[PDB]
């Protein structure tokens, strides 16, 4: 006789709407990630902020794929780079004054341009000597700034610093990572990898008290990495899917009405 079957029809309808709402809520909480790479023809000269306390910069120069042997390992030489001294106050603690030396970074990644730095510390009471360094994207931005101390204070918190020790040569391969945030901020940051090589001290024994620091800065590759967060929750697609499901259920109900019209 006459049997009611559409109860299951709107039960399935409500069930589908419930799962659609749950799925949309779940997708709203777990954005996926996307990674891309961008090739550059030349880099913008970065800024390297060095923090030598009493160590004096013996030499600095711009080189290419090979560094010529040092004429004199531990004596003053020629400085052939653009440097800028700055004084500011540590944001972490406002009782310590920080003096930094800013050096232009290399640009020609295609020609494997590099910057070679050599410092000397005469004497100290510490038993683990190292020099702090920080990397920021644009040296020109540092130059044309009404408040250089404020720029340095902001970069102290916005960036992370590393160390290089004496008695070694440290080779640093540096790369750029850009990130797109939900609010739309373009966050640029530095990645870096180090390689340490023992320094063979051939200086006379009278000069062995002084400690030498050697460091090299140059780009790893011309590829800048890009990371973006993609949200896979589109309300209009969900609305269209729900509408299509509702139409399908309505036409299935009409077909069932016809079927029970013939026989049932």
């Amino acid at each position: 006789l006459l049997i009611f079957i559409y109860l299951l029809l709107m039960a399935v309808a409500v069930f589908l709407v419930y799962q659609t709402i749950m799925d949309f809520r779940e997708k709203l909480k777990h954005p996926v990630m996307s990674v891309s790479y961008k090739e550059v023809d030349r880099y913008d000269a970065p800024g390297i902020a060095l923090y030598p306390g009493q160590a004096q910069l013996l030499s600095c120069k711009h080189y290419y794929e090979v560094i010529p042997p040092l004429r004199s390992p531990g004596q003053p030489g020629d400085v052939n780079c653009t440097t800028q001294r700055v004084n500011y106050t540590d944001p972490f603690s406002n009782q310590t004054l920080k003096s930094a030396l800013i050096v232009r970074g290399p640009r020609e990644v295609q020609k494997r341009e590099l910057v070679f730095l050599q410092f000397r510390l005469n004497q100290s009471s510490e038993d683990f000597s190292a020099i702090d360094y920080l990397l920021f994207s644009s040296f020109q931005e540092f130059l044309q700034s009404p408040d250089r101390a404020g720029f340095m204070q902001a970069c102290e918190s916005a960036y992370s610093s590393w160390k290089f020790s004496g008695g070694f040569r440290t080779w640093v391969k540096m790369s750029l990572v850009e990130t797109k945030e939900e609010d739309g901020r373009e966050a640029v940051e530095f990645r870096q990898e180090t390689s340490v090589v023992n320094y063979i001290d051939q200086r006379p024994a009278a000069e062995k008290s002084a400690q030498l620091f050697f460091v090299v800065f140059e780009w790893k590759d011309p590829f800048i990495q890009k990371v973006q967060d993609i949200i896979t929750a589109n309300p209009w697609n969900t609305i269209a899917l729900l509408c299509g499901a509702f139409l399908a259920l309505f036409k299935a109900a009409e077909f069932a009405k016809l079927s029970v019209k013939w026989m049932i």
Copy 2:
């Protein structure tokens, strides 16, 4: 005259169903990944398992952003940390007995807390001296455990061990990575970045034969990195998507029927 056109209609129907099934099967095999970061106000004191064979722990202390200079680089000092000695058997080979010293790690990342350790090895025949260490999440979990040896054996396989060498000071910045998989094991693991600094030996030449090991443990940042695997294949969304496609083909047939008539 009368021309049959709906042949293409259900041909397109079968076409769409076939590609929908293929897309669903393909999506079932390639789950996407999602990455999030969680900021903490304080960490849970980790456990550092150290394996010094004959080296003796000269000193250990809890510090902050700067370490004061050593009063004496290579003489016994004061131990100011909580340590626990344990013995167990190596899961990799059940013929070797391992003795470990467990140290409770730093807790406050907001104040940049450090743990500083200094060991001394008197003499040995090896020409490459290093000390093994392992990191696990909770020291309290180790403390309150009916079988500490079983805990160590499980952590030996569940975690990865590293080394720090003599004649250096090693600075280790550690971070926490949580991972969620299909069945829900909520795995937690450690990541590190290490920096080595030469030790300027100013000790008298009579004591130069002994090797000094210095190591520092610190949290890199208060951010824990969470990774999850998201499956983008929803069977019920596909069913509703397939259901809607059939309606258009049926609805267009009536419009096509009117055009024929």
Copy 3:
């Protein structure tokens, strides 16, 4: 009276057409990434290209989880590995000739197999001595090749090289990363982590002028890490989604006609 409301109906139709098309265009530009791991029962013996200028290979051997202590740190020993010398021209600059020594890498990861290498450099004028090395996937592929020089020239650009310094022992843990791209290059590359340990020089003072290089090669784990790029924009799904949306406005309008009737 008679009020026209379907103006909003095809306004919503045009809005829904502009949407999902903006979405398709956006999704075609941002493919998602998928990460998987594959367990192996045994690796394939890699090729290690070493570039010692004047340093002579004192010793090479295949070991397991522990290396026995050296019988003599700085004297010639026994070479117990398969090596092949090759000469070619640097692709970066065609005016320099490069001579490489190819060593067949470790094979079994379940037993923690090691390759141990020891070189000696007698004397040189440089003040920073290091040896270059490069890793490629298959040593057998290198062996059976009509042009070995061309193989090395291709591997120079297709791979990246690292260095290991003298006065240290360098331990290298290496792993394989596979990547699937659009047209199917299935690029395989090497990831590596290093650990340096000070070498305790106990040689007589007369032989201290020579530099000793020690290096160890081992697989980190039996997990090959795979990366794929998934495009989430399916035109067939988009067409079906648009088809369902159009029918909703048509049937709702018919219901609206009944409502005003």
